């Protein structure tokens, strides 16, 4: 019965594992490895729901075809939706239901794991020792309390990183956000009025704002020039908060001592896919990946047992809610009043 | 002048840098790349002081030659001295002055970096992405608060790890030590009465006891059998706390999910030296290094700016103290009343 069937695009073994574990409602799930696009959309024929991820191509023509073939609801197993044609889903009365937030422990701790990696260089040590090279020159770290940390964006994830740094290491932490978070001020963390004060004061900067016309390229030549010599920059939030071209200039000169990102402006053609043996045509990505003081990872900050359990459970619950007409406002992306 | 001269064995670029920076006492320092042993000891001829590290061979014959050639004091730029013939130093009236403790922040934070690395697998993601492999299957982590941590030994280092885990992540921490540390009980951490309770209750275990006849092979077939399925084991303290043969058996069976060590029972022939292109003859070390869920690093937990500054500064001040007859009791390792 179509009303009980989900076609899950961009399937991976970890999605199979967790959706089957949490599918206590006896939905039938058709796992498709291919991304959703105009060539694969027919695999969803007769599925009341499709379940998609960040790189699935939910264009006007795809959504039209989905609707023609019986699809009533789009379950985004993620927070983002920039490849979903919301207007077409609106016009066809198809709700787009998402997972609005990821486990803030998972993501804040991944940002911390990038700081610790670039600080103590465990990954560099691992590569050396695998080659029977037990030399440690080049691996000088810093004590965590020796640096001033700047948290840009104090939502739930930035808040949790604030707490780890301040309460766990007793470090000095400075925050920036138009909206002050009472849980941050309650543990003694000061907010500054301008981003210029973050650049001026912080040795380690971690970005946690959404991407919009005001935060795009927040890290660029102008702001890099104001930062402290040797600044460490962390970005697990959105690729385009950082202008990669300018970051490269700053890494080359030594102004930026290191860069850790779990996101990248042009991640669509690369992330989650094994592209070994093909040239990465994006030069900035090739360069960044090749630098010794840079970590680029494929948007895995949410990939803990607890966090992926919540992502899959929420997506399954979104279908339960859709079928019972009790959609949660926080999870509804679009406006599916059909034209 | 002979009584102002130090010969520093096992020299490295980072020792040169830091001893030169901190030598405000007009000492002359002869930096010798070779380890101290019977073939190089002549390099120290005429030096009032030798400065040695963990792998220097300060054997009876070496110390006697040192003395015959004018050496009056041995400066260990480290806490350990297991290769120093204390009895021969005693008989010749040569004080052995050490650095008794490393920065507890540096070492506790390195232990945390090993946990984070084995948990979130940043080093595995780094190696994949450098091959243009952006697949993340196999890198599922855990939220830090989801595990129970056992800290075995609550001296200054273990205490600082307790604080980071308990106060930083709000995790449940269990401690073991004959001597309870008030700073640990003050933050609500319970001590258990037997090691068997650590094996029974803890998902992540970090070792911070000295090596002696009672802690040797604390991790072995018998205790590994008692641990929780999938235990993670960390050891930045002493190599032979872990029986590497038994650890390998537990890694193969899956009983141990991961192992991170910054020390190793037979590190002497390997650590601090670039041995690429030579076979590692120690099979257990070759095997451990080759496993995907194991991190072995070359005793670099102390290697932060703050910690190495203290090591070199304390070693220089030890010579200042020797020359002015104000040796600090805490830094004296032996009983240099000549025979």
Judge contact between B86 and B334, C-beta under 8 A.
yes
Count of C-beta atoms within a 10 Å radius of residue B72: 19
Euclidean distance between CA atoms A309 and A290, whole angstroms: 33
Judge contact between A220 and A243, C-beta under 8 A.
yes
The nearest CA of chain A is from the CA of B93 a distance in Å of 35
Is residue A128 flagged as an active site residue?
no
Judge contact between B244 and B265, C-beta under 8 A.
yes
**Which distant-in-sequence residues (6+ apart) come within 8 Å of A213 by Cβ?**
none
Judge contact between A259 and A233, C-beta under 8 A.
yes
Measured over the CA atoms of residue A31, residue A33, residue A38 and residue A42, the dihedral's sign is negative
> What 3-state class would DSSP assign to B243?
coil
Measured over the CA atoms of residue B269, residue B275, residue B281 and residue B287, the dihedral's sign is positive
Judge contact between A113 and A136, C-beta under 8 A.
no
Max Cα distance, chain A (Å): 68
Question: Which of A120, A134, A146 is facing B113, going by the closest CB pair?
Answer: A120
Measured over the CA atoms of residue B67, residue B71, residue B75 and residue B76, the dihedral's sign is negative
Euclidean distance between CA atoms B126 and A297, whole angstroms: 7
Consecutive H or E run containing B150: strand B148-152
> What 3-state class would DSSP assign to B256?
strand
Please indicate whether, in this complex, the C-beta atoms of A143 and B305 are within 8 angstroms of each other.
yes
> Could you give the C-alpha distances from B323 to A205, A330, B39, B71, B318, in angstroms and in order?
46, 73, 28, 13, 9
**Which distant-in-sequence residues (6+ apart) come within 8 Å of B74 by Cβ?**
B49, B50, B52, B58, B63, B66, B84, B89, B94, B95, B96, B97
| Residue numbers in A near B143 (CB within 8 A) | 103, 105-106, 109, 304-307
B49 backbone dihedrals φ, ψ, rounded to 5° = -125, 145
Q: Can you tell me which residue has the tokens 């080659």?
A: A131
Q: Please enumerate, as own/partner, the contacts of A30-39 that have beta carbons within 8 Å and a separation of 24 or more.
A: A30/A5, A30/A6, A32/A7, A32/A8, A34/A9, A34/A10, A35/A9, A35/A10, A36/A9, A36/A10, A36/A62, A37/A62, A38/A62, A38/A65
Judge contact between A276 and B127, C-beta under 8 A.
no
Q: Can you tell me which residue has the tokens 């037997």?
A: B194
Consecutive H or E run containing A86: helix A86-91
Measured over the CA atoms of residue B31, residue B32, residue B35 and residue B40, the dihedral's sign is negative
> What 3-state class would DSSP assign to B138?
coil
Judge contact between A20 and A312, C-beta under 8 A.
no
> Could you give the C-alpha distances from B215 to B151, B212, B219, B242, B243, in angstroms and in order?
14, 5, 9, 9, 11
Judge contact between A72 and A287, C-beta under 8 A.
no
The number of residues in chain A equals: 339
Query: Closest by alpha carbon to B132, among A279, A295, A45, A179?
Result: A279
Euclidean distance between CA atoms A261 and B165, whole angstroms: 24
Question: Which of B133, B167, B296 is facing A129, going by the closest CB pair?
Answer: B296
Is A320 labelled as part of a ligand binding site? no
* Sequence-ordered strand ranges (E) for chain A: 5-8, 28-31, 49-52, 73-76, 96-97, 148-152, 172-176, 190-191, 204-207, 231-235, 256-261, 294-296
Pairing of strands A96-97, A148-152: unpaired
Please indicate whether, in this complex, the C-beta atoms of A276 and B112 are within 8 angstroms of each other.
no
Judge contact between B45 and B90, C-beta under 8 A.
no
A238, two tokens: 């959105």
B103 exposure class (CB count in 10 Å sphere: 0-12, 13-18, 19+)? buried
Euclidean distance between CA atoms B148 and A13, whole angstroms: 28
Q: Can you tell me which residue has the tokens 């030890």?
A: B318
> What 3-state class would DSSP assign to A159?
helix
Judge contact between B59 and B35, C-beta under 8 A.
no
Euclidean distance between CA atoms B108 and B236, whole angstroms: 9
Euclidean distance between CA atoms B82 and A171, whole angstroms: 36
> What 3-state class would DSSP assign to B237?
coil
Please indicate whether, in this complex, the C-beta atoms of B304 and A141 are within 8 angstroms of each other.
yes
Q: Which of A33, A128, A132, A263 to mutate to test the interface with B (most CBs of B within 10 A)?
A: A132
Max Cα distance, chain B (Å): 68
Return the C-alpha torsion angle A70, A73, A79, A83, nearest 10.
Answer: 40
Question: Which of B128, B164, B304 is facing A169, going by the closest CB pair?
Answer: B164
> Could you give the C-alpha distances from B213 to A294, B85, B218, in angstroms and in order?
44, 19, 10
The gap from C-alpha A297 to its chain's centroid, in whole angstroms, comes to 10
> What share of residues in chain A are helix, strand, coil (percent, to 5)?
40, 15, 40
Judge contact between B231 and B259, C-beta under 8 A.
no
Nearest residue in A to B124, CA atom: A123
Judge contact between B80 and B35, C-beta under 8 A.
no
Nearest residue in B to A300, CA atom: B136
> Could you give the C-alpha distances from A135 to A28, A132, A173, B280, B321, in angstroms and in order?
55, 9, 34, 15, 32
Please indicate whether, in this complex, the C-beta atoms of A109 and B116 are within 8 angstroms of each other.
yes
Query: Closest by alpha carbon to B190, among A210, A334, B181?
Result: B181
This structure was determined by X-ray
A149 backbone dihedrals φ, ψ, rounded to 5° = -105, 135
B63, two tokens: 């110390």
Count of C-beta atoms within a 10 Å radius of residue A180: 13
Euclidean distance between CA atoms B176 and B209, whole angstroms: 10
B185 backbone dihedrals φ, ψ, rounded to 5° = -65, -30
Measured over the CA atoms of residue A312, residue A304, residue A184 and residue A220, the dihedral's sign is negative
> Buried b / exposed e across B282-303, counting CB within 10 Å, b at 16+?
bebbebbbeeeebbbbbbbbbb
Is A100 labelled as part of a ligand binding site? no
Count of C-beta atoms within a 10 Å radius of residue B19: 22
Q: Can you tell me which residue has the tokens 């203290």?
A: B310
Write down the domain spans for chain A: 2-103+303-339, 104-301
DSSP β-bridge partners for residue A294 = A259
Judge contact between B286 and B61, C-beta under 8 A.
no
B56, two tokens: 């220097």
> Could you give the C-alpha distances from A162 to A191, A306, B159, B179, in angstroms and in order?
12, 21, 22, 33
> What 3-state class would DSSP assign to B23?
coil
Pairing of strands A204-207, A28-31: unpaired
Is residue B163 flagged as an active site residue?
no
- What are the DSSP calls for A203-256, one per residue? SEEEE-PPPSTTTTTSBSHHHHHHSPTTEEEEE-S-GGGB-HHHHHHHHHHTSE
**Which distant-in-sequence residues (6+ apart) come within 8 Å of B107 by Cβ?**
B157, B160, B236, B301, B302, B307
Euclidean distance between CA atoms B164 and B187, whole angstroms: 11
């Amino acid at each position: 019965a179509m009303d009980m069937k989900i076609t899950l695009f961009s399937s991976k073994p970890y999605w199979v594992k967790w959706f089957n574990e949490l599918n206590k409602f006896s939905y039938e799930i058709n796992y498709v490895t291919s991304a959703c696009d105009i060539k694969s959309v027919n695999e969803a024929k007769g599925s009341e729901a499709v379940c998609c991820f960040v790189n699935d191509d939910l264009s006007k023509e795809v959504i039209e075809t989905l609707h023609s073939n019986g699809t009533k609801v789009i379950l985004m197993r993620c927070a983002g939706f920039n490849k979903v044609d919301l207007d077409t889903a609106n016009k066809l009365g198809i709700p787009v239901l998402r997972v609005p937030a990821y486990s803030p422990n998972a993501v804040s701790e991944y940002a911390l794991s990038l700081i610790m990696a670039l600080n103590r260089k465990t990954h560099k040590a691992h590569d050396r020792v695998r080659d029977a090279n037990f030399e440690i020159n080049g691996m000088e770290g810093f004590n965590m309390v020796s640096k001033v940390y700047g948290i840009v964006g104090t939502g739930n994830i930035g808040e949790q990183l604030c707490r780890v740094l301040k309460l766990g290491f007793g470090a000095k932490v400075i925050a920036y956000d138009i909206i002050e978070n009472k849980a941050v001020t309650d543990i003694g963390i000061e907010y500054v009025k301008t981003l210029d004060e973050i650049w001026k004061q912080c040795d380690v900067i971690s970005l946690h704002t959404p991407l919009n016309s005001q935060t795009k390229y927040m890290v660029n030549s102008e702001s890099i020039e104001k930062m402290r010599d040797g600044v460490m920059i962390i970005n697990v939030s959105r690729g385009a908060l950082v202008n990669a071209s300018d970051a490269i200039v700053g890494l080359k000169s030594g102004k930026i001592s290191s860069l850790g990102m779990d996101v990248y402006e042009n991640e669509t053609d690369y992330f989650y896919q094994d592209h070994n043996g093909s040239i990465i045509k994006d030069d900035n990505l090739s360069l960044l990946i090749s630098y010794p003081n840079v970590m680029i990872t494929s948007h895995q900050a949410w990939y803990t047992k607890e966090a992926i359990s919540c992502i899959c459970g929420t997506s399954l619950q979104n279908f339960v809610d859709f079928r019972s007409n009790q959609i949660k406002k926080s999870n509804l992306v679009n406006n599916p009043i059909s034209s």
